[PDB]
Amino acid sequence: YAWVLIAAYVAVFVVALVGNTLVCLAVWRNHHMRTVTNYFLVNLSLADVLATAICLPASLLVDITESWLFGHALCKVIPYLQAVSVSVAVLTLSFIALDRWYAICHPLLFKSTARRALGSILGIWAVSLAIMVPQAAVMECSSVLPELAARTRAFSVCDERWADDLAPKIYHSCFFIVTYLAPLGLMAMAYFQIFRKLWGRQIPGTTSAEVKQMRARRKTAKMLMVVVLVFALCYLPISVLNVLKRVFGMFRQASDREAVYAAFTFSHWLVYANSAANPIIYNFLSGKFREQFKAAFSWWL
């Protein structure tokens, strides 16, 4: 079990870094690949690399050693950067769907540009950095017997420190709704309307150019729906496990301590596995990204 963890964590580390760097290079090299959607997808890669590079290594040591060995300052920074990486992801996926929904379903209300996209991308970070500040405030590094901290860090853990039972129940309920259920719920309805408008609307006088627009828009909607679907599945375990632990007070009886720790461990890895999955999704569901990933691999061999 222990080596399978390190092997899986190492594979996700390499694939996510190599893949997400190629995702930025592909949009940079190809000019008429700099679409609003693909600019948001690059911002999604910038979040994934921040999680993979910085938070993932702390991820492996905590799940194996079961203790925090990086000191008090990083106990707030790293969990904060992990939380910010999640907010940036879900907000980027939300703006993508909002962009596609006004494009496919309500075509002439708002106009999306590359100039407005970079402004949204800077807004996604301004919000993600702000709303995760309370999370960093709650992070505290403390050892079993705190007098032990003067001797070693092998027995200290970095966890949330709440002053009352009610506060975590409200906090983690709001952040499950706000950052998982609500966005995915609104997005599932948006892509369903996008699905109906792309597959089914057969108005009699559609020009040959209107169809060449649809046949390409279908290929992007197919790719983006697979991305949202994998994101929902990847973050489902950690999100439900966090709510059952914090809000519902579960997983406190040490009779099933082994199964609970193996569950949360796999849930932590699944979060990073999503960072490696997305570039793979682009390779198979996007011929333009596939074409760019082809060239980057020829230069190397």
Ligand X SMILES: CCCCCCCC/C=C\CCCCCCCC(=O)O[C@H](COC(=O)CCCCCCCCCCCCCCC)COP(=O)(O)OC[C@@H](O)CO
Ligand Y SMILES: CCCCCCCCS[C@@H]1O[C@H](CO)[C@@H](O)[C@H](O)[C@H]1O
Residues near ligand X, by CB under 6 A: 94, 97-98, 101, 178, 181-183, 185-187, 189-190, 193
Verify binding: residue 163, ligand Y, rule CB under 6 A.
yes
Measured between alpha carbons, how far is 255 from 251 in angstroms, rounded to an integer? 9
Q: How far is the CB of 235 from ligand Y (least distance, A)?
A: 19
Cβ partners under 8 Å of residue 246, min gap 6: 168, 169, 171, 172
Among 151, 204, 254, 301, binds ligand Y (CB under 6 A): 151
Q: What residue is closest to ligand NVK based on CB?
A: 59
List the single partner that 55 binds among ligand X, ligand NVK, ligand Y, none, CB under 5 to 8 Å by kind.
Answer: ligand NVK
Query: Which class for 142: exposed (0-12), middle (13-18), buried (19 or more C-beta within 10 A)?
Result: middle
User: DSSP assignment, residue 105?
Assistant: T
Nearer to ligand X, 12 or 228 (CB): 228
Nearer to ligand Y, 138 or 236 (CB): 138
Q: How far is the CB of 12 from ligand NVK (least distance, A)?
A: 11
Query: Angle between the 208-246 and 71-104 helix axes, to the nearest 10 degrees?
Result: 150
Enumerate residues 166-195 that contact ligand Y by CB under 6 A.
Answer: 166-167, 169-170, 173-174
Nearer to ligand NVK, 19 or 79 (CB): 79
Q: Give the three-class secondary structure for 69.
A: coil
Q: Which residues bind ligand NVK (CB under 6 A)?
A: 55, 58-59, 62, 78-79, 82-83, 86, 135, 158, 175-176, 179-180, 235, 238-239, 242, 268, 271
List the single partner that 169 binds among ligand X, ligand NVK, ligand Y, none, CB under 5 to 8 Å by kind.
Answer: ligand Y
Q: How far is the CB of 209 from ligand X (least distance, A)?
A: 27
The sign of the CA dihedral 268, 274, 276, 277 is positive
Q: How far is the CB of 254 from ligand Y (least distance, A)?
A: 18
The sign of the CA dihedral 278, 284, 288, 293 is positive
274 labelled ligand-binding: no
List the single partner that 88 binds among ligand X, ligand NVK, ligand Y, none, CB under 5 to 8 Å by kind.
Answer: none
Give me the residue label for tokens 């950052």.
179
Residue 139 pairs with which residues in a beta bridge?
160
Please report, for residues 50, 139, 157, the alpha-carbon distance to residue 74 in angstroms, rounded to integers and kept in the order given. Answer: 15, 10, 12
List the single partner that 262 binds among ligand NVK, ligand X, ligand Y, none, CB under 5 to 8 Å by kind.
Answer: none
List the single partner that 35 binds among ligand NVK, ligand Y, ligand X, none, CB under 5 to 8 Å by kind.
Answer: none
Triad 121, 133, 45: Cα angle to 5°: 35
Give the residue from 220, 181, 12 showing the smallest Cα distance to 90: 181
| Sole window of 60-68, 94-102, 162-170, 189-197 interacting with ligand Y (rule: CB under 6 A) | 162-170
